[PDB]
Design a protein around this ligand. Structure first.
Ligand SMILES: CCCCCCCCCCCCCCCCCC(=O)O
Ligand SMILES: [Fe+3]
Ligand SMILES: [Fe+3]
Length: 222
């Protein structure tokens, strides 16, 4: 792709902002989770530190392409999901917080970042390669915890999914056209996110009917 074209740079201004904002919010989210889960405080602080590194990497990706990120756009993009995390944290709802960041958001990021890698400029490709591998660890942390605590967490997981999965589906739709400009096909993003999230839900303990119901709250939101 022509990384120096005005159409590419325009789309990149919003995409770069979105990823910078997402990493920043993930840093705050894992730091908040560290307070909520004393037994895993050290591990969660380590995950937060990785997010800070990711944020700085993506800031450099924008600099490399001479793109100024549209942070106002990115704030608004995350706002509804972010405020839901904040409310859950205030309520001491650790399960909801874990689902939002560790599973929903990390799965969205894994799906999107892996689709970006083969169309990314060489500088951004190497950065993204390093970021996605941390994302596997983040998702794995959430899966391990929720699986180990499945019975106690299940009802809240269902409630949290119903409220928050539609928000990420709306985000997926909002980003689709800019992502297409960057060479990332919407069909791939949708499939890969649905597969990743569905598999995560199966891995933690949900049945086929439960996975379909949970996934449908997202798909039906469009
Ligand atoms: C600037 C280069 C990265 C471009 C990748 C394409 C991204 C397009 C989809 C937008 C969704 C990004 C979600 C980011 C959330 C990050 C959360 C986390 O790090 O745990
Ligand atoms: Fe990250
Ligand atoms: Fe992460």
């Amino acid at each position: 792709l022509d990384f120096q074209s005005e159409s590419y740079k325009d789309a990149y201004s919003r995409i770069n902002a979105i990823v910078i904002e997402g990493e920043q919010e993930a840093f705050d989210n894992y730091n908040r989770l560290a307070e909520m889960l004393p037994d895993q405080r050290d591990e969660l602080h380590k995950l937060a530190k990785m997010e800070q590194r990711h944020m700085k990497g993506f800031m450099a990706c924008g600099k490399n392409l001479s793109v100024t990120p549209d942070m106002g756009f990115a704030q608004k993009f995350f706002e509804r999901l972010h405020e839901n995390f904040k409310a859950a944290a205030a309520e001491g709802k650790v399960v909801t917080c874990l689902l939002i960041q560790s599973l929903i958001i990390e799965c969205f990021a894994i799906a999107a970042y892996n689709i970006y890698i083969p169309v990314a400029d060489a500088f951004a490709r190497k950065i993204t390669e390093g970021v996605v591998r941390d994302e596997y660890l983040h998702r794995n942390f959430g899966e391990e915890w929720l699986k180990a605590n499945f019975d106690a967490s299940k009802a809240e997981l269902e409630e949290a999914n119903r409220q928050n999965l539609p928000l990420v589906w709306l985000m997926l739709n909002e980003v689709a056209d800019d992502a297409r400009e960057l060479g990332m096909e919407r069909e791939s993003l949708v499939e890969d996110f649905m597969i990743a999230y569905g598999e995560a839900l199966e891995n933690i303990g949900f049945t086929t009917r439960e996975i379909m119901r949970m996934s449908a709250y997202g798909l039906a939101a469009v």
